[PDB]
Design a protein around this ligand. Structure first.
Ligand code: ZN
Ligand code: ZN
Ligand code: ZN
Ligand code: ZN
Ligand code: ZN
Ligand code: ZN
Ligand code: ZN
Ligand code: ZN
Lengths: 284, 129, 59, 273
């Protein structure tokens, strides 16, 4: 247990961490980012990136399959990619199309390629599948929601391929999106059980077992698990969790889909795990 | 400091070549290059050949350094990213494989097979120096 | 010997496997093994098979 | 701004391979490998050797007892007894029943696999699969599908176990173990596509894609140090193209810093970007 020096003048929003565990990441309301040295437990700043014109939310990293890449998304509508070049951190390439404030950003499995995904309040699903020679082949899917998308999550690589991802917006609804053989990201299913504004969606990493799991947290209390045990049936059978006193916005999985930790409006983190009888049990 | 015409003598070239062969047989590894260096310095006809020339397979475009040509079989990182000799990339004449020089050195020190996946050709334990 | 004479496996984890071994050895006409294993293991396994089959083996 | 989402001032998510981070009203990193069904120390201590499968079993049992789990010792003991080389199938049914059809072979493995699948860990699953990986025409084909101790219908699942434990291993940072484990995959590897290297012939000066020339029937690459034919690794110079057998230039660049071929071309800082 070691506490990193914040050194910021704004409230943080998310703190992702690189693949090997070396460097921490940061967000704030001053439109600034900072990557530190978690190695050996001694917090050393390696950059203070003067970023966009507004606060940022998510900084999810990428696989070293393609190298040292960073992602960022801000209230000032802009998508920015950073790469640590020659001992320094500097701008690499950007996406421009953003009618409204962007809500989320996540990367793709390191077998589909080097694909980004983002969602803005404009309700347009704009994948940012990075092409060759530094350009990004920005595909788009407009009017993905009545109000706007909030968060997206990708699906583990299972046997080209059959790519997938899941998303949900402020319409109190959750969507899923597959691709045709030509490359049309039209629709696969529309799962709806919550009435509050769903915020975050995640996929449990696939060990090899033929059972998926989508833990999603809505605005009020909906923390329903979205298990899809049958591959052909494509039927999702809820198994609702406890009801949080305040709003829950974040969800995160362990590396073997054993432990689920959720973040809520009570400024507290509770760690959960499914019991023998199939019920989810909280922990210390 | 012989002139170009003198350096073109068949006797001179044959004698130099005989000395080179003798110096090779003596196993004095780091010294034969010294004579080669002096030959290249004194004369610009003694320049070495390009030898290795990376141009084969499918070429391709929209993905180039300056799809890909290497891949780190033991780190799966495209070669050329920023102990200097430990950062180079080796290639296999037989195993048709390659990877990071330090990674390959460590793996071949520990493991004793083609780390190239589903392969059997020893990319280094073939000359047996 | 490994199974019986031994963050632990559940206690009655190997019962079905042992019973199926006894059935497999007895079925193919080799009772010299089923009877001997039954006698040696005793109460660890005897309370798993019915009485009629045991009497058949022994006789 | 009502249609915009509302500010989030808390969060806690997984990272690395055994840690968390909670930004709830600074951020704390706590090692939580104690709750994951996987343990890094076992990953460090394990060993797989196709030369002698029995030895790997006993050494893994010793490591399991060392780390303090009285389940893996039972499992590995049953394994080392089960994979004895005297239980090998014969390529003719008409002699004796295979060990797979014994109720202590395939069925015991299936039960243990189901148990650890319930436990939701990949370590022991991948290790066990890796260790166990080793009219008349119809009868021969059915016997062939029936000899082995691993069900042919779940080969994709076993490969998935292996290539997930591999990502775990790469996350930890002990990669040579990953390169060892990822061999037993039944799936052929993907080949490389793009540019490739060619060594000009040492006799006819032609670009030949191979260790032997297709015209002069000789070696195209000659060591820049030992002045002989080479068959191993090169790691040559890309600017000038000169190179040799790996130990030779490693020794050369230990202290010397000029191209042995004589073109000067000090690439020790040029090629190494
Ligand atoms: Zn090209
Ligand atoms: Zn080779
Ligand atoms: Zn490498
Ligand atoms: Zn190889
Ligand atoms: Zn030739
Ligand atoms: Zn060079
Ligand atoms: Zn050279
Ligand atoms: Zn050599």
């Amino acid at each position: 247990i070691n506490t990193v020096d914040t050194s910021h003048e704004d409230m943080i929003h998310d703190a992702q961490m690189d693949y090997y565990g070396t460097r921490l990441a940061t967000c704030s309301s001053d439109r600034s980012v900072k990557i530190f040295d978690v190695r050996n437990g001694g917090q050393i700043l390696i950059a203070d990136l003067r970023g966009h014109e507004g606060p940022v939310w998510q900084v999810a990293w990428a696989h070293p399959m393609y190298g040292n890449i960073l992602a960022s998304c801000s209230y000032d509508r802009k998508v920015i990619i950073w790469r640590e070049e020659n001992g320094t951190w500097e701008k690499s390439h950007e996406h421009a199309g953003h009618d409204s404030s962007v809500n989320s950003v996540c990367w793709a499995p390191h077998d589909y390629g080097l694909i980004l995904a983002c969602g803005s309040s404009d309700g347009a699903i704009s994948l940012l599948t990075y092409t060759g020679e530094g350009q990004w082949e920005v595909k788009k899917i407009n009017n993905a929601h009545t109000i706007g998308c909030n968060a997206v999550s990708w699906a583990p690589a299972v046997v080209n391929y059959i790519k997938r991802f899941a998303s949900g917006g402020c319409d109190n609804l959750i969507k899923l999106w597959k691709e045709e053989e030509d490359g049309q990201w039209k629709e696969e299913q529309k799962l709806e059980a919550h009435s509050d504004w769903v915020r975050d969606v995640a996929w449990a990493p696939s060990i090899g077992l033929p059972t998926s799991t989508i833990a999603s947290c809505s605005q009020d209390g909906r923390v329903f698990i979205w298990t899809c045990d049958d591959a052909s049936s494509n039927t999702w059978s809820p198994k609702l969790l406890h009801k949080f006193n305040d709003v829950v916005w974040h969800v995160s999985w362990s590396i073997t889909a054993n432990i689920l930790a959720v973040s809520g409006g009570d400024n507290k983190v509770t760690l959960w795990k499914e019991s023998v009888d199939g019920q989810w049990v909280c922990i210390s | 400091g012989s002139p170009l015409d003198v350096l073109k003598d068949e006797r001179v070239q044959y004698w130099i070549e005989n000395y080179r062969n003798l110096l090779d047989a003596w196993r004095f590894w780091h010294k034969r290059a010294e004579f080669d260096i002096h030959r290249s310095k004194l004369d610009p006809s003694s320049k070495p050949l390009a030898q290795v020339f990376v141009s084969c397979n499918f070429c391709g475009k929209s993905i180039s350094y300056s799809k890909p040509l290497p891949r780190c079989a033991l780190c799966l990182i495209n070669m050329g990213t920023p102990a200097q000799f430990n950062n180079w990339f080796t290639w296999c004449h037989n195993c048709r494989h390659g990877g990071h020089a330090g990674h390959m050195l460590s793996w071949f020190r520990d493991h004793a097979e083609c780390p190239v996946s589903a392969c059997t050709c020893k990319c280094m334990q073939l000359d047996t120096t | 010997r490994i199974i019986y004479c031994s963050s632990r496996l559940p206690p009655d984890f190997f019962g079905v496997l042992v019973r199926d071994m006894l059935h497999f050895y007895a079925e193919q006409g080799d009772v010299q093994m089923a009877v001997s294993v039954l006698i040696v293991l005793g109460e660890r396994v005897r309370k798993d098979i019915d009485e009629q089959t045991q009497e058949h083996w022994y006789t | 701004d009502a249609n915009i989402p509302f500010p989030r001032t808390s969060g806690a998510r997984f990272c690395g391979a055994g840690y968390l981070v909670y930004f709830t009203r600074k951020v704390i990193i706590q090692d939580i490998a104690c709750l994951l069904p996987v343990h890094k120390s076992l990953g460090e201590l394990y060993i797989l050797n196709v030369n002698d499968i029995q030895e790997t079993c006993q050494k893994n049992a010793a490591s399991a007892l060392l780390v303090g789990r009285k389940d893996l010792v039972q499992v590995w003991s049953l394994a080392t007894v089960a994979t004895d080389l005297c239980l090998g199938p014969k390529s003719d049914p008409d002699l004796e029943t295979p060990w797979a059809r014994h109720p202590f072979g395939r069925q015991l493995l299936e039960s243990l696999l189901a148990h650890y699948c319930r436990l939701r860990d990949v370590q022991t699953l991948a290790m066990l699969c890796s260790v166990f990986e080793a009219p008349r025409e119809r009868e021969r084909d059915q016997h062939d599908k029936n000899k082995r101790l691993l069900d042919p219908a779940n080969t994709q699942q076993f490969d998935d176990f292996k290539k997930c434990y591999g990502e775990i291993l790469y996350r930890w940072g002990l990669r040579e173990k990953r390169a060892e484990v990822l061999k037993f995959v039944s799936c052929p590897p993907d080949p490389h596509k793009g540019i490739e290297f060619g060594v000009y012939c040492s006799h006819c000066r032609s670009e030949v894609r191979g260790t032997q020339c297709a015209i002069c029937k000789g070696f195209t690459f000659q060591c820049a140090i030992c002045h002989v034919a080479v068959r191993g690794s090169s790691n040559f110079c890309l600017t000038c193209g000169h190179g040799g057998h790996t130990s030779h230039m490693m020794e050369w660049f230990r202290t010397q810093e000029v191209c042995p071929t004589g073109c000067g071309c000090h690439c020790l800082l040029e090629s190494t970007f």
